[PDB]
Amino acid sequence: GNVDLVFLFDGSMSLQPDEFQKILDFMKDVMKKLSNTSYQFAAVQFSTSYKTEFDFSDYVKRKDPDALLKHVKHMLLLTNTFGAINYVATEVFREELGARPDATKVLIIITDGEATDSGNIDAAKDIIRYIIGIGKHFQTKESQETLHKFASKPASEFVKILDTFEKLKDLFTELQKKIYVIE
């Protein structure tokens, strides 16, 4: 059926210009591949606070991915992941913002560091949540587990750990192998 997918990307102080660009490229690639499908998209940059770069209505109005993200500016601040996730659940997934009523909700969280805040993401528990942890900040198994709480279960399918930002290209390659025209 319909799929309303939200990209919640890390814009923290740790990211180098090229790394931030690779995150933007990844989001665009998936969007272009899935253009003219039953998917609709929204994008929110998060660091200390949260900013919807374009919401569902924006995408519907102008499907152009490159145009939708041409205005993004790297925040360069903290990594308040609990707040960011709750922000999507209540401020982005809204009918008035273009979200479709009984559409399946999906969240693709991309981050390069552990969350600097805490609390709960209970309000977002019914959204299908994928998280992509990139870079040396996720070298240890300990740091990787910290991401499970944000993603759906099992972690084996929903939590993806990438050692480099270059690997985002590999991940896109792999996701395309999972694309099918369903009966």
Ordered strands of the 159-162 beta sheet:
50-54, 39-46, 3-10, 104-111, 128-134, 159-162
**Plot region of 147 (φ>0 → left; ψ -120 to 50 → alpha; else → beta):** alpha
The yes or no reply on residue 113 touching Cl ion (CB under 5 A) is yes
Assigned token pair, 100: 């479709």
Q: Which residue lies nearer to its own copies by CB, 162 or 175? A: 175
The residues in 141-160 that bind its own copies, with binding defined as CB under 8 A, are 157
- Can you read off the two tokens belonging to residue 117? 């805040």
71 binds, among Mg ion, its own copies, Cl ion, none (CB under 5 to 8 A by kind): none
Mark the segment that binds Mg ion (CB under 5 A) among 12-20, 50-58, 65-73, 126-134. 12-20
Q: 57 or 116, CB closer to Mg ion?
A: 116
Residues that bind its own copies (CB under 8 A): 3, 34, 36-39, 157, 173, 175-183
